[PDB]
Design an enzyme around this catalytic site. Structure first.
Site, PDB file in Angstrom:
ATOM      1  N   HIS A  70      50.055  44.420  28.964  1.00  0.00           N
ATOM      2  CA  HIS A  70      50.437  44.617  30.352  1.00  0.00           C
ATOM      3  C   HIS A  70      49.249  45.078  31.176  1.00  0.00           C
ATOM      4  CE1 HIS A  70      50.820  48.565  28.376  1.00  0.00           C
ATOM      5  NE2 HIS A  70      50.535  49.090  29.553  1.00  0.00           N
ATOM      6  N   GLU A  99      57.442  55.143  38.756  1.00  0.00           N
ATOM      7  CA  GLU A  99      56.925  53.852  38.328  1.00  0.00           C
ATOM      8  C   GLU A  99      57.984  52.754  38.230  1.00  0.00           C
ATOM      9  OE1 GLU A  99      55.214  54.916  34.461  1.00  0.00           O
ATOM     10  OE2 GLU A  99      57.277  55.009  33.704  1.00  0.00           O
ATOM     11  N   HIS A 120      38.867  41.695  39.604  1.00  0.00           N
ATOM     12  CA  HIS A 120      40.135  41.128  40.031  1.00  0.00           C
ATOM     13  C   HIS A 120      40.963  40.454  38.945  1.00  0.00           C
ATOM     14  CE1 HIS A 120      37.232  37.793  40.427  1.00  0.00           C
ATOM     15  NE2 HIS A 120      38.254  36.974  40.263  1.00  0.00           N
ATOM     16  N   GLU A 131      43.870  37.213  43.127  1.00  0.00           N
ATOM     17  CA  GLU A 131      43.451  35.838  43.324  1.00  0.00           C
ATOM     18  C   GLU A 131      44.497  34.829  42.867  1.00  0.00           C
ATOM     19  OE1 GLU A 131      40.056  34.652  40.999  1.00  0.00           O
ATOM     20  OE2 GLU A 131      39.910  32.695  41.987  1.00  0.00           O
TER      21      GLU A 131
HETATM   22 MN   LIG Z   1      38.191  34.540  39.831  1.00  0.00          MN
HETATM   23 MN   LIG Z   2      49.741  51.240  29.697  1.00  0.00          MN
END
Ligand SMILES: [Mn+2]
Ligand SMILES: [Mn+2]
Lengths: 122, 131
Positions: free
Chosen positions: B7, B44, B69, B118
């Protein structure tokens, strides 16, 4: 719709050092390399780690450490294993499902997680 | 060895506002909210975005902007539509980056906490096809 993940790009000060890091710990598999300082083109490499396209580009390291992080999946039977492998790189670690937290040489917090989403919820 | 990706966890100042962002742009599927129970160490929520397990935690850490990114895959026929959906939400978008041949169209934009995202319309295969 979003078909899925394309890739993840990280900025690091020393490409060579980070590479050994990704190879020693994640068994990263370099598949591409480009760049040329004398031609003013930043250096960068593409690696494959457990099927993921990971790109590394040379630049400035994160100026501070936050709890934002990327986590990879490992079996719970290998926690001690990966814990010792990491302790061997000198990198600083930050001492259900057991998890291992540690930074690279550029302040990117990574995690090795034993356990999955299903388990997590259920 | 690494089984795969577990994750990605992001830190944001406003959970509710970030949640709307994810659900609107990424069609994020909320599968968990600390609010679902009593006594949670922190605020969360967990989402499923195109297979990926994305976790959001409310916090104060506001890292500087960097080219670090996460890029999600899309088709090039959908670049206009996503540019529109993002424009409509008033979220900031970077100009097109210079590209070599075989890179593919991309859209760069931030969330509300300096997280560069992106949407990529290319493939690794087209980027390795050259010498
Ligand atoms: Mn990229
Ligand atoms: Mn974690």
């Amino acid at each position: 719709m979003i078909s899925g993940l394309s890739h993840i790009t990280l900025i690091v000060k020393d490409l060579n050092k980070t590479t050994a890091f990704l190879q020693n710990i994640f068994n990263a598999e370099e598949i591409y390399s480009s760049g040329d300082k004398t031609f003013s083109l930043s250096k960068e490499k593409f690696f494959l780690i457990a099927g993921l396209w990971i790109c590394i580009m040379e630049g400035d390291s994160l100026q501070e450490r936050t709890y934002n992080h990327i986590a990879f999946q490992i079996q719970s039977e290998e926690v001690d294993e990966y814990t010792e492998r990491i302790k061997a790189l000198g990198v600083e670690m930050k001492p259900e499902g057991r998890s291992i937290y540690f930074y690279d040489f550029d302040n990117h917090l990574f995690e090795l997680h034993a356990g999955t989403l299903e388990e997590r919820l259920k």
